[PDB]
Amino acid sequence: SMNPPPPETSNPNKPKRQTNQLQYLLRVVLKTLWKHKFAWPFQQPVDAVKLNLPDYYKIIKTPMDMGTIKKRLENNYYWNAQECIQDFNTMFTNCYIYNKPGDDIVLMAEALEKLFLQKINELPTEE
Ligand SMILES: COc1cncc(-c2cnc(NC3CCNCC3)c3[nH]c(=O)c(C)cc23)c1
Numbered sequence: 001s002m003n004p005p006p007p008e009t010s011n012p013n014k015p016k017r018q019t020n021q022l023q024y025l026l027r028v029v030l031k032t033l034w035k036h037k038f039a040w041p042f043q044q045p046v047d048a049v050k051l052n053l054p055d056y057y058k059i060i061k062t063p064m065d066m067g068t069i070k071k072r073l074e075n076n077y078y079w080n081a082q083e084c085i086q087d088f089n090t091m092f093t094n095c096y097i098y099n100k101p102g103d104d105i106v107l108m109a110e111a112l113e114k115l116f117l118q119k120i121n122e123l124p125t126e127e
Helices: 020-034 066-074 081-098 104-120
Strands: none
Touching: 020 066, 020 081, 020 104, 066 081, 081 104
16 A cells, blocks of 8 residues: 655745734744643654555545644645645545445544534634
8 A cells, every 4th residue: 555755745836924923823822732631643644654554645635634734834835724734634535435424533533523613613814
């Protein structure tokens, strides 16, 4: 089966900016989910080999994880906050697609998503 390369975390042909929303996404939103007790399985791409999940990248063709999101924020990969929020949504949806309901990992994703939405609700205004 084997893993794909991780998602892109840099792009030399994309302009860059630091904004209030992006800073909040790293310092408050990502930081808060990162330190959650359920965070670790989502802190890096799913290693289908080590975990023995050979069909993972057959089923999930748009992988995403918080390690990638963190690196994207640190590398100024996102221009719009929406890009980052979309990546979180993709991560959670992947989990709901690949795993079975009631799997420990699905409940963990549910709790993390609730927390995520709580924090996105207090995102500072665009400007
Ligand atoms: C360091 O990464 C991990 C740590 N702990 C757990 C996982 C993990 C394990 N199993 C998964 N799926 C199986 C659960 C039991 N039923 C068959 C599928 C996982 N699925 C996922 O989507 C993620 C993100 C982690 C994971 C990854």
